[PDB]
Amino acid sequence: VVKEEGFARGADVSWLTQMEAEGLKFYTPDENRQEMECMDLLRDYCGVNSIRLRVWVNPKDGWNNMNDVIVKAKRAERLGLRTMIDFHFSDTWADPGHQEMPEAWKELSFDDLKIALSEHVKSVLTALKAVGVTPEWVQVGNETTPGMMLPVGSVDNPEQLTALNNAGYDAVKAICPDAKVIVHLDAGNDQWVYNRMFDILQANGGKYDMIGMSLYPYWAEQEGKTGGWLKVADDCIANIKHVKQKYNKPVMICEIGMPYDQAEACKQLITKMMQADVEGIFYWEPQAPNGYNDGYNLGCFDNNAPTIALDAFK
Ligand SMILES: OC[C@H]1O[C@@H](O)[C@H](O)[C@@H](O)[C@H]1O
């Protein structure tokens, strides 16, 4: 098997090692319904050529730590899958409402905080290099719409945010000179969020190679917003065009998802977005059963097998 080039048809499968430990099984969606390892299933039946993995610094239960990430990245590599590493710079989930630095970093000087961030990035990438894995892409933060490691890396501290961003960028290039560094925000439909962040980076010499977006549009259907999920997708396509023009950087859809029970609409969304001016699309945790963790319903499996959603990728 060899890694594909070109458009990234991806999945984030960070939960996979925990699910395996908990005893979940995955099956082929054809008549034979063969039990199968999940990455191999995604590659062979869902057209996936790329895998994304989150990194948490000192997580209580160990999942998403460097050690776990190495396991999944080695498996991706062996199966001929390209890898994206997504640094949360937290001990737990990083998202627009929750950007908490690791507890161990909370009393460092700003100068030592930059060094700890840098050392975390380098140590993870160095360990990946040692086991034969060179990521194609790396995110410096995850959905950093308000900044990262708040309050210190808040957009309200543009100099400090930029300095943390650049420590990350520098650390990636140190170990992986050809890795594309992604700044990833949520709400790809929302130009204003992108303007604010990327104008901060412009104003302060922020380094990044690629703009990352999340697209989860089904809420607009459910809340009965005029235009439905299609309007949110069209607004995302407009925003993709806008950031390319204004900042001259390529765009990745780092996360996409629809309700597991919206197979047909999800297939159409992905088919639609595959013609947008992006370098790839990563389905977030496609294998997660409805209800997983806190009640997650935006997987694209049912009865432990892929729905037609990722038929877009085949
Ligand atoms: O369980 C799915 C997870 O989705 C994440 O993006 C979020 O940050 C977590 O708090 C949890 O909702």
Quoted resolution (Å): 1.8
Total of domains in the chain: 1
Q: Which domain holds residue 233?
A: 1-314
Q: What's the half-sphere exposure (Cβ side, CA atoms, 13 Å) at 209? A: 16
2-30: burial string, b at 16+ Cβ within 10 Å, e else: eebeeebbbbbbbbbbbbeeeebebbebe
Give Cα separations from 247 to 84, 117, 140, 197 (angstroms).
22, 26, 18, 11
Residue 293, ligand 1, Cβ within 6 A: yes
Give Cα separations from 109 to 113, 116, 118, 152, 176 (angstroms).
6, 10, 14, 11, 27
Q: Which atom of ligand 1 is nearest to the CA of 292?
A: 1
Residue 218, ligand 1, Cβ within 6 A: no
Task: Report the structure determination method.
Answer: X-ray
Residue 137 pairs in a beta bridge with 84, 180
- Active site includes 255? yes
CB 238 within 8 A of CB 276: no
What is the CA angle 256-217-154, rounded to 5?
75
Of 77, 136, 221, 255, the catalytic one is 255
56 CA → ligand 1 middle, Å: 14
Pocket test for ligand 1, best of 90, 260, 294 (most atoms within 8 A of CB): 294
63 CA → ligand 1 middle, Å: 14
Rama region for 293: left / alpha / beta (φ>0; ψ in -120 to 50; rest)? left
Tokens of 88: 């949360």
Q: Which atom of ligand 1 is nearest to the CA of 285?
A: 2
- One-letter amino acid for residue 31 of the chain: E
Q: How far is CA 263 from the centre of its chain?
A: 21
Residue 154 pairs in a beta bridge with 147
Residue nearest to atom 12 of ligand 1 (CA): 294
Question: Residue 27's closest CA among 295, 266, 287, 296?
Answer: 287
Residue 93, ligand 1, Cβ within 6 A: yes
Residue 150 pairs in a beta bridge with none
Give Cα separations from 165 to 87, 99, 115, 174, 196 (angstroms).
11, 14, 12, 14, 15
CB 54 within 8 A of CB 142: yes
280 CA → ligand 1 middle, Å: 22
